[PDB]
Paper text:
As a proof of concept, we used this platform to identify both known and novel L- and D-amino acid peptide binders to the well-characterized model target, streptavidin. The surface loops of streptavidin are flexible: upon biotin binding they undergo a conformational change to form a closed conformation, but to accommodate the peptide ligands, loop 3/4 is dislocated by 13–16 Å from the biotin closed form to adopt a well-defined peptide-specific structure. All eight L- and D-peptides discovered in this work bind to the same pocket of streptavidin in distinctive binding modes suggesting (1) the rich malleability of L- and D-peptides and (2) the ability of streptavidin itself to adjust the flexible loop to accommodate multiple peptides with diverse sequences and conformations.
From these “secondary” peptide families identified in the initial screen, we chose three 5-mer “hot spot” sequences: LAEYH, PAWAH, and FDEWL. We used a series of array peptide libraries rationally designed around each of these sequences to successfully evolve the three sequences to 12-mer L-peptides. The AFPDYLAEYHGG L-peptide had the lowest Kd value, 43 nM, among all peptides discovered in this work. One L-peptide, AFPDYLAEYHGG, showed a Kd of 43 nM—a 100-fold improvement over the HPQ peptide also developed in this study, and 1,000-fold greater than Strep-tag II HPQ. Strong correlation between specificity in the substitution plots and co-crystal data was also observed for the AFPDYLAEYHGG peptide (the highest affinity for streptavidin in SPR measurements) and the RDPAPAWAHGGG peptide (the longest stretch of highly specific amino acids between positions 2 and 11) (respectively).
Author numbering:
A (entry chain G), C (entry chain A): 15 to 135
B (entry chain B): 16 to 135
D (entry chain D): 15 to 139
E (entry chain E), F (entry chain F), G (entry chain C), H (entry chain H): 1 to 12
The structure:
Amino acid sequence: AGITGTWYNQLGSTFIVTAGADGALTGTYESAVGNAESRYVLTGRYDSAPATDGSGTALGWTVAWKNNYRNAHSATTWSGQYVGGAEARINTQWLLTSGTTEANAWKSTLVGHDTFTKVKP
Amino acid sequence: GITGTWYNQLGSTFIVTAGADGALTGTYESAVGNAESRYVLTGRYDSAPATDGSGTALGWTVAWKNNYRNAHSATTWSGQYVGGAEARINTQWLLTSGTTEANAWKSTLVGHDTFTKVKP
Amino acid sequence: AGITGTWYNQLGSTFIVTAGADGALTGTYESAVGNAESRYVLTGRYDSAPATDGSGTALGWTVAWKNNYRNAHSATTWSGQYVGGAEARINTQWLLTSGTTEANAWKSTLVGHDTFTKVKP
Amino acid sequence: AGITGTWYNQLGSTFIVTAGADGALTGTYESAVGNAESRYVLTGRYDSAPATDGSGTALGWTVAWKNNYRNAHSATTWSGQYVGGAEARINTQWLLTSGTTEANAWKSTLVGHDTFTKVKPSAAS
Amino acid sequence: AFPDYLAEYHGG
Amino acid sequence: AFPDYLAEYHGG
Amino acid sequence: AFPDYLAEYHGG
Amino acid sequence: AFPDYLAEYHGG
């Protein structure tokens, strides 16, 4: 039980993360195929002493879409919470920002959502 | 360009280092800047941005826990660095609270902020 | 357009809307129980001449959370698209803003998402 | 004083709105040039009985980016509040959604923000 | 405000 | 679509 | 939670 | 940019 582990969205995109004792999230995020070109560094933070009243655990992380194979000139942040129990889940909303000219900055940031579980689809 | 000390219009201040392989690491504190106000910041940035006038994509997270207090919440900033004589980081943020399942629908606030290297 | 009709989310909250030839959306949004105290005016706009390439139909609407019975001092906007098919769907992102003091304005606006179909759950 | 009136963002985009007594917003949003091709219908709602405690007035509106001249196959909603005082202001966050294929729906919706006042930028100081 | 009776209308 | 002529209406 | 001391860090 | 290969990572 806990945030540390391997997580999947419904499309099989997979992050492998360690949740450190003083709030660090560190790992990788890769495609369902899991080839090297598809793998990116994931870094974030979480509440290492959450409430004990049934509340989830607040967290967030970032992936910049550059690795040693390709570069999309963009980065995504996910903001959400971890919910423990029999079917642990991380529910998120995300922001995806592209590097843009000043003229195009108004259309630099997309919003969306996703959910992750430890069960491989 | 990114590495350094940044301020918003209220004087909240972070130090950040843009590492060789895309890491952002630093500390975000209040305008008063006392120990209780300091939080760890971690994120990522595009270490090889386009050369066509585009900004540099980045993001970071602060979980609002330190050794002194804990808000049971965390914020992510998504945005871009724009270099030059008046360098700026323009962001959109999401602030999520740990909530019960019944309250999860109202767990996440949205907003925006801009940072510069000049003290207000 | 296919938008005119009665729509439901997964919790059974339901709106009944007309998509006018002029691009207007007009109707009522109510709770699953649907008592009078639960009903609010909905108004919005949609693209009355969408692309013919498989794209959805862009739309948005607003509900201010005031009726004669109660007032939450808040309003929500939904931005999204209608997706035609054997089973039509409207997918949305929403922003819920409260009236606040200036000091609390930073925490005035929540974000989320929801999806609606014409099938009562 | 109030929501009814002509509002401008910093680029001079101009909305002309009427706030009806029981919560309707109706009007038009146009460019700084203000020619017919630039003008779009706006509709929304606002809290017609805001709290009497220093709070602003919650509101929202939508523009679909189609008029008789052109069609971007997209629509924007603005969510925010009206704030009275020495220079009245409407502060907003917005969502702009494009009609997309199902494959591209994940990248259908941009987020941003804007602020409006009743002062035309050419007269601003 | 964000009262609990609004939750269902927002999908929660 | 998000054509450039929409920029000013969105504050950009 | 969203305590008031967080406001400045969020630009408000 | 928002290339199509990013879709799955965003749930799309």
